[PDB]
Amino acid sequence: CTLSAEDKAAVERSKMIDRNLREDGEKAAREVKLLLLGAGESGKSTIVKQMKITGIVETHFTFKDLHFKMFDVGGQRSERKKWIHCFEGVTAIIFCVALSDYDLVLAEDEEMNRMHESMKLFDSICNNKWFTDTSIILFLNKKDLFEEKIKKSPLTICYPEYAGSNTYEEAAAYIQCQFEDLNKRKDTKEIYTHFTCATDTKNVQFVFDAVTDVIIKNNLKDCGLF
Amino acid sequence: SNNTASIAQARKLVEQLKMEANIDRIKVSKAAADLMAYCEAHAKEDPLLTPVPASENPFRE
Amino acid sequence: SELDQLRQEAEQLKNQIRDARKACADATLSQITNNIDPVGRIQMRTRRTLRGHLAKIYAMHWGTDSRLLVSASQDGKLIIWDSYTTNKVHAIPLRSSWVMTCAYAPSGNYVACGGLDNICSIYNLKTREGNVRVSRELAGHTGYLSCCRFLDDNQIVTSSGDTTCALWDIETGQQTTTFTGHTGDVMSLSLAPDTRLFVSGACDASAKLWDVREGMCRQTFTGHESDINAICFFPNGNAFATGSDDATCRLFDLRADQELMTYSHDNIICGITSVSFSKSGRLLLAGYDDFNCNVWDALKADRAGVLAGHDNRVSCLGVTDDGMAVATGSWDSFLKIWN
Amino acid sequence: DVQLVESGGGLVQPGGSRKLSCSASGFAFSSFGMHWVRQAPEKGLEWVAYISSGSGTIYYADTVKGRFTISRDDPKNTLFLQMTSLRSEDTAMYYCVRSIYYYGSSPFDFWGQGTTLTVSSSDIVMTQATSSVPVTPGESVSISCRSSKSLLHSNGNTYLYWFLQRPGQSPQLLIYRMSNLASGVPDRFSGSGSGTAFTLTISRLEAEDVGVYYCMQHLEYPLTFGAGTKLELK
Amino acid sequence: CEYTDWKSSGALIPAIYMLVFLLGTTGNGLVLWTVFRSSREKRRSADIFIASLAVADLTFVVTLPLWATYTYRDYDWPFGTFFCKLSSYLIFVNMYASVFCLTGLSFDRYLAIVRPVANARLRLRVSGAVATAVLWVLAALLAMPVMVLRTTGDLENTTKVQCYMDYSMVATVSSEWAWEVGLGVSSTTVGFVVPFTIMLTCYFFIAQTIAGHFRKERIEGLRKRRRLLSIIVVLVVTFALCWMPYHLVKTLYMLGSLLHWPCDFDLFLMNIFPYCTCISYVNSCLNPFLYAFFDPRFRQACT
Amino acid sequence: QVQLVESGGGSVQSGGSLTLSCAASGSTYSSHCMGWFRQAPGKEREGVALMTRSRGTSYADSVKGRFTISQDNTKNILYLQMNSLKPEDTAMYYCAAVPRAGIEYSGAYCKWNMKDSGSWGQGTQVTVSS
Hints:
F: Immunoglobulin-like; 0% helix; cytoskeleton (chain A); adenylate cyclase inhibitor activity (chain A); ADP-ribosylation (chain A)
C-alpha cells in the first residue's frame, strides 16, 4: 500500500503481538477461575494446603487434565464492593464456613456469633449483582471438631429457632440448609455443599466435580439446551 | 491503648481542621470568572469544542 | 470527657469551614455563565477502534506525545497502542492480572501498572534488551492500588485501598510521603498541571487536595453523596471535577474551596467511572455505567453530547495533551477513539 | 551486554558455498529484524539481506537475489546467511545489524563485529559528494548526503540514517530518522535536512570522532548506503 | 390407472396451506423479534443461528399463500411466470437454509458441549456470522437451477397455466427425465442425506456426553438428564418425522421411474406429495417453539 | 429417446371395433405417459386421447365416449379400444410419449406442450371400410 517500509514492519510487529495475545487468551480461556472466600481464617489455609497436596494470593493446580486458578482475597481488608466486580467471569466461588463457629460468638467481638457473620457474608456474595450467575462451592471445614462441639453444646445456643436434636448428622444438615436457603437465585446458581476437614483429601475431587458440573451447565445454557 | 489512639485521632483531626480554616479563601464569582476567562482564551486551541478539518485531524485523515 | 471536648472542637471547626465557604459563595457558576453562548451539539464520531484486549479494560492513560497510549485489562497484559495507526507497540505480560490502574510517564521511558496485588510495577520501555522489563516493584500499600501517576521518571504518586496515597521514589523504592488523612478507599488521583499538588478522591465522599512537596493536605472538599471513582484536574490547576456513584460529577475549585456546579441528569441513574477534561476546560467528559459516555458543558452543566459506542460500562476515559482525540475503555474488550 | 558475534568466512574457492552464522546475545533476538550489510576491503557499505521478526518478510538485494538465503532460528539465537554462488566480488566483510520497528524505535542500532569472507579470483542513490575533508579536533563541521528520491513520507518522517565507522570498528548509529539521536551517542551530532538533500553536523571533534560516515535510507528496502565521508584527523 | 388426484387436494390443501402460513408467520415473527431484542443481551454463541433459521422461515412461508391460491384454482398458477420462478427459488433457498442452519446449530452445540477446550477453538468461527453467510450463499448456489429452469406454461390446452419448470433451455428432450432424476437425487443428497447425518451424529455425541455426566444418583440430576435427553430426541424425531415424508416420497418416485412400480402407487405418491409439502412447512412452523421458545432464557427475554 | 411402435391397422367396416395398442420402451406412467395422435391421408395430426393430470380422460371431442384408451405401466402398452369405425377414421395413428413434469410444485403434469418436439411414433395407417 502507501505505507512506509518501517510502517509495514511495525504493522508486522502488530500482527505478532496479536498472535501472542490470541494464544495467551486461548490458554487463559481453558483455565478455570475460582474465588476463595471465607469468614476469616476459618479453613481457607487448611483447604488450600490439602488441595495442593499482601494482595491477592493465586494458587494454581491441575486435577484430571484441568488447570485451576484460585484467587484468595482474604488479605485485602478494604471496601469489597470496589473490587468484587473484577471476579465477574469466575467459574465458581469456594466459600469456607467453619462449623466450629456455631458456639463461637466472638465475631467482630461484641456479642455476635461467627456463624451469622459467615451467614451475612455468604448472603452478600450470593446475592451480588455481579455474582447472579456464578455457582458457589460451599465448604464446611470443622467437621472433625464439630462432633465434639455439638456433643458438648447445643445448636440452640447459636440458633434461637428450633434446631432439632443435638446429633452431628442432623446438626450438619440444618446448618447446610440454613446456609443454602439464602440463595435468592435458586433458578440460576447452585450451592455445592461439602463437609470437609483437615484429614479430608477429596476436597480437590469435589471441587473438580463442582466446576465440571458448572461447565456442563454453562455449555448447555449457551447452546440453548437448558 | 485504644483510648490514647482515639485521643491522638481527635487531636490530629482538630489540627487539620484548624489548618484548613487558616487559608485565604476567594470568591466564587472570581473563581468562575477565572474559569470563563481560561475557557474563552483557550477555546480556539480545543479540537473537540471547535472541530478541526481533515488536514488537521490525525485520525480522520 | 476530653474526647467529647475534642469532638465539640472538631464540630465547631467544621461549622467554621461551612460558614466560611457560605460567605465565599456569592454568585453561582450557572448564574455567571447564563449569559454565555452554548457549545451546541458535540457529535464525536469513533475514528479508531483498538481491538486486541481479551478481557475488561480497567485503565487507560494517554502519553504526552498524544499518539502512544497504554491500556490495562483484566488479562495480565498492558498493550501500548499507536492511536494514529491502530498499531500495537508493546504487549507486556503481568505478574498479577488484577489491575485497575495504569500510567504513562511524560517522558515515555516508563509505564506504570498496579492493582489488587498491592504492588506498583514500573516497566522500562526503552531498554537495550529490546523488551519491556519490570524496573521496580513498589510495595508498602495495604490496599488495592487504585491509581498511579508519574510526576517525573523517578517519582510516582499512587493511591490505594487503604486511606493512603503514597509518593514513591522509583530508584530507591521508598515512600517519600504517606499522605494520610482519608477515611475511605482512595479511588482516583489527578496530578495538577503544575505538578506540585494533586487531588485524591476516596470512598468517604470527599476529595482532598494534597501537597507533594510538604506532604500535607491543604483542603478537603465535600458535597458528594457517595463514593468518588474518578477525579480530574482542570487544564489550569485551579479546579477539578469528581465523578461519583450518585450519577453526578461536581466541579470543585481550589481558590474558593467550594463546589461550583453539579452535572446531573434525571435519566442518568448510573455511577460515573471515569472523568476527564477536554483542553481549555470547556467540555467535561464523564464515562458512565449505562454503557456510554457523556460530554458535559463544564461551564453550563448541559448534556451536550453522548458517545454511545460501548456494550459495557466505560471504565476509563482520557483526553490527549493537545486536546485532539478522547479515548474510551470499556469492559467489552474494546478501546475507541473519538473526534 | 548486547553482542553479535559473527562466524564463518575466510579463504574459499570462487563458486563455493559458505554459511555465515551470527551468535546473538542477550538482546531478545526473537523481537528484532536482522540485516546483513557488507563492506568491500576499500569500499563502502551495501545492504545484503533481511529477515523480519518471526521470519515473516525475507528481502534480499538485487545482486544476491537468487544466490543468498537469509534465515533465522529464534532458539539458540542464531542468524544464518547461506551463499550458494560465490563471485570474486563477494570478498566483503559482512555485518549483522539488528533493527526493531515501532513508533519510537531506533532501527540499525547494534552492528556486530563482523567476519571477512575472502574469495579468490529503482534503487535510491545516495551520493555523499564529500568523500574526504580535512578536519581538526574542536572545530564544528558538517557532512552532506543527497537522495535521488525524496526521503520524506506522508507519515511525516524522513528516513535518513547516519553511521560512524571508526577505524577498525563496526559502524555505530549516530542518528536514526533525522534529528533523532541514537542511544549512547553524544549530543554534538545533529541532523536536519530538506527532504532531498540532507546534512549531518558535528559540534565538536574528538579522538573517537574521526572515521568514515555513511548515510542510509529506509524509505524503500533496497537500502542504499552512500559512499562514506572520511574525516582526516588534524 | 386412469385416476388423476384426490378431490380434497383442491379444497383442504389451500386451507392447510393458509393455516400453517398463519402459524408459521406468527411464531417465526415473534421469535425473530425477541431474538432482535435479546441479541445484544444474551450474546449466545448460536443466537445468529436461530436468527438465520427464523428469517429463512419467514421467507419460506411468505410465498406459500401463492401455492394456496394455486391449489384453490385446481392446478392453475395465475400469479405470473417470473413470480413462479421467484417463489420456487425462494422456497428452495429457504429449504436448504433451514436444513443447513439446523445442522450448523447441531455442530455448534457439539463443539461447545462435547469438548469445551479444542472443539470450542474450532467453534470460534462457526459461532460468527461468517458461517451463516457461507451457508446461505451455498444454499443459494444449490437452488440456482430452480431459478434458471422455472417457467410457466399451459398444458393439455386447459387454459389454466401451471408453475412447472422448463428444461429444454439446457437439457435435451431425450435424456430429459434422466436430467430431472439427477437433479432430484442431487437435491435430496446434498440437502438431507449428508446434513441429517451431521445433525444425528452431533446429537448422538451430545447425548453420550450428557448421559456420561448426569447420573441417577442425584434426584435433580436424573430429572435433568431425562429432560435433556427428551428435548434432544424430540428434536431429532421432529426432523426425521417431518423430512421423511417429502424426501422419502420424492426418492421413491425417482426409484419408481427406473423400477416400474405399479401405477396405483405412482398416483398415490403424486397425490400425497402436497401433504408431504404441508408437513415440510409444519416442520419449520414448529421449529421456533422447539429451538428458541424451549429456552428458559429466551422465554424470560420474551417476558 | 423412448421407442414406441403402434400395432393394428386391420380393415374393418363401418361400426366395427378394434384395439389399437402401442408398446413403448422406457415410458412409465411415473416418468413418460403416452398419447395417441392420428393422420388421415392428406390431413393434420389431431389428438385422440391424452393421459394428463387434469381430466385424465382427454379424449377428442370428435371421439368422446366412443374411443377408449388404456395406459398400462406394467406391460408398457397403450391400448386404444376404439368403437364404431367411420370412413373418416382412416388415419395413420401416431402414438406419442412425452415426459412428466416435476412433482415439487408443478403437479406431475405431462408436457403435451412439447409434443411436437417430443417422441412421435412411426404412425400406423388404420384402414376402415364402410
